[PDB]
Amino acid sequence: VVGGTRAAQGEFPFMVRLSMGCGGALYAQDIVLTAAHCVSGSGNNTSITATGGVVDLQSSSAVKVRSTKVLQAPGYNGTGKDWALIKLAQPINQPTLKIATTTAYNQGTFTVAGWGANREGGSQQRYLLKANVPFVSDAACRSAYGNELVANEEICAGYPDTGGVDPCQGDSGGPMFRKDNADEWIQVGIVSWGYGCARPGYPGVYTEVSTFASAIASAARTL
């Protein structure tokens, strides 16, 4: 995360770090919701590691669990539908993150977090970083990305005029969230892509969770 600050231990306990350099959220204690582009496809897979329970990846308190299977959004090909679920061999005993099923929260100021780079071309982070990024309308986002932006499948956030705060390489798959009307965090997005990181005129793009919530929920029941 470019322009982020250190998250406190226990602040966002649903966060998990994935071995390929992605973030993810605990949709269930043993099911990670991440980006489709973080995996190569669906199927049995025991080569992925999810590190949960800590902001400091070097902590002896970290829990490292291996995957058993991956379910990448059906039909994924790099043009939207950027979501995937990863079944874990053992559950990570931490709070889970509720996903948005309506579009009522696709507005306001969001929060993102990850161990990705804090500068373009930078190395990964040892400590979880968090940042607040305001919602950016489809129109403004489209003024930047044109046809690359998939209407209804992608939501944008950040500072369109001046940049400065934005997820970066290594943060993909992480959840973008905010408070619902019950003072509980709810997930409206999944870090997906952007041109560069934190650049004026180029906001961050995220998987619009509300659009795929029913699909994610059904797929998760099959894991």
- Residues touching Ca ion: how many (CB under 5 A)? 2
Binding to Ca ion by CB under 5 A, coded x per residue (else -) over 125-154, reads -------------x----------------
Minimal distance, residue 208 CB to Ca ion, in Å:
5
**82 belongs to the catalytic site:** yes
Catalytic residue among 37, 67, 171, 192: 37
**Residue 194 near residue 205 (C-beta atoms within 8 A):** yes
CB of 138 to Ca ion, least distance (A): 5
- Minimum distance of Ca ion from residue 42's CB (angstroms): 25
Residue 56 is a binding residue for Ca ion (CB under 5 A): no
Q: How far is CA 211 from each of CA 99, 103, 191, rounded to the nearest angstrom?
A: 11, 8, 15
Q: Which CB, 81 or 130, lies closer to Ca ion?
A: 81
CB 14 within 8 A of CB 96: yes
Task: Closer to Ca ion by CB, 56 or 138: give it.
Answer: 138
30 versus 208: smaller Cβ distance to Ca ion: 208
Cα dihedral 18→19→22→23 (10° resolution): 20
Q: How far is 78 from 82, CA to CA, in rounded Å?
A: 7
Q: Report strand pairing: 185-193 vs 98-99.
A: parallel
Q: Give the residue with the Cβ less far from Ca ion, 138 or 180.
A: 138
**Catalytic choice (166, 171, 172, 210):** 172
Active site residue 172: yes
* C-beta closer to Ca ion: residue 61 or 147: 147
* Smallest distance from Ca ion to CB 95, Å: 28
Distance CA 173, CA 92 (A): 17
Query: Is 166 one of the catalytic residues?
Result: no
With a CB cutoff of 8 Å and minimum separation 6, the contacts of 43 are: 69, 70
Which stretch of DSSP H or E encloses residue 214?
Answer: helix 209-221
User: Which listed residue (82, 171, 192, 210) is catalytic?
Assistant: 82
Q: Which residues are catalytic?
A: 37, 82, 172
Contact positions vs Ca ion (CB under 5 A): 138, 155
